[PDB]
Write an enzyme that holds these catalytic residues in place. Structure first.
Site, PDB file in Angstrom:
ATOM      1  N   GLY A 120       0.809  -1.205   0.000  1.00 19.33           N
ATOM      2  CA  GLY A 120       0.000   0.000   0.000  1.00 19.33           C
ATOM      3  C   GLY A 120       0.844   1.257   0.000  1.00 19.33           C
ATOM      4  CB  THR A 213       5.286   1.529   2.495  1.00 18.75           C
ATOM      5  OG1 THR A 213       6.707   1.349   2.607  1.00 18.75           O
ATOM      6  CG2 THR A 213       4.702   1.835   3.857  1.00 18.75           C
ATOM      7  CB  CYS A 214       3.995  -0.593  -2.520  1.00 17.18           C
ATOM      8  SG  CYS A 214       4.285  -0.971  -4.274  1.00 17.18           S
ATOM      9  CD  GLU A 215       8.551   1.943  -3.385  1.00 24.25           C
ATOM     10  OE1 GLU A 215       8.333   1.911  -2.155  1.00 24.25           O
ATOM     11  OE2 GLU A 215       8.853   0.931  -4.041  1.00 24.25           O
TER      12      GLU A 215
END
Ligand code: NI
Ligand code: NI
Ligand code: NI
Ligand code: NI
Length: 235
Positions: A120, A213-215
């Site tokens: 996310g 977390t993902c970018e």
């Protein structure tokens, strides 16, 4: 009286005013969906399949729901054929920078793999996985040790036992391991890296969920926040 938010939030674009109209519309859509899901849950008190069969009418790719009381983490979990299908797409399959909270394409739902991974965005506007950053503080962890996770095949609790920051280069996460030794090493390593202390007993016989977390593609972000939890079957 009976207010869910600090301020009242309009849901119809025609009545949404002020700055960041789009962000407010995106927020409205999640509030609407959260309401639909909450009513579904209160209705099917003995099951969970009907709740998701209903959500699948909106998008068959909605495979679960993740929620942490007292925080903004209250979203549907999407799954596509790749790990970028829903990187910048919401549950309505509409283009959105923050996209969705999504499960790794390799993961199973009916019978969970050793490690289930959810991704996310973390843009710092208190939405999606911004909450993972809060887990880096012992105080917050102590008061948020359990996260709710449901899917069409069951209701679960995620017992957080590790939270740490790593790089964005660490892009290959195992869903299953060659043997118990490697899984044991992963569990040990996971606790070793944790910046918070946990008293949760996790063994190779257990299943875990990784929240990361993902970018965006070609982003400047260099760090990722990872929270790992033990999966407990509720009903
Ligand atoms: Ni007001
Ligand atoms: Ni408003
Ligand atoms: Ni108003
Ligand atoms: Ni498109």
């Amino acid at each position: 009286g009976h207010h869910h938010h600090h301020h009242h939030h309009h849901h119809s674009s025609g009545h949404i005013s002020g700055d960041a109209m789009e962000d407010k519309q995106e927020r409205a859509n999640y509030e609407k969906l959260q309401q639909k899901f909450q009513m579904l849950m209160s209705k099917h008190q003995a099951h969970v399949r009907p709740q998701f069969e209903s959500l699948e009418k909106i998008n068959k790719d909605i495979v679960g729901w993740i929620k942490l009381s007292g925080t903004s983490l209250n979203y549907p979990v999407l799954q596509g054929k790749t790990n970028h299908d829903y990187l910048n797409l919401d549950f309505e399959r509409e283009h959105r920078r923050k996209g969705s909270i999504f499960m790794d394409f390799r993961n199973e739902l009916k019978n969970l793999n050793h490690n289930t991974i959810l991704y996310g965005h973390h843009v710092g506007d208190n939405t999606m996985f911004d909450v993972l950053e809060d887990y880096l503080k012992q105080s917050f962890y102590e008061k948020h040790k359990i996260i709710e996770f449901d899917n069409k095949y069951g209701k679960y609790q995620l017992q957080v036992f590790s939270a740490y920051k790593t790089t964005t280069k660490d892009n290959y996460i195992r869903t299953d391991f060659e043997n118990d030794q490697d899984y044991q090493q992963f569990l040990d390593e996971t606790k070793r890296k944790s910046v918070i202390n946990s008293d949760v007993n996790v063994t190779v016989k257990d299943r875990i969920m990784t929240l990361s977390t993902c970018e965006d593609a070609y982003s400047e972000t260099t760090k990722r926040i990872v929270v790992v939890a033990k999966i407990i079957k509720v009903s």
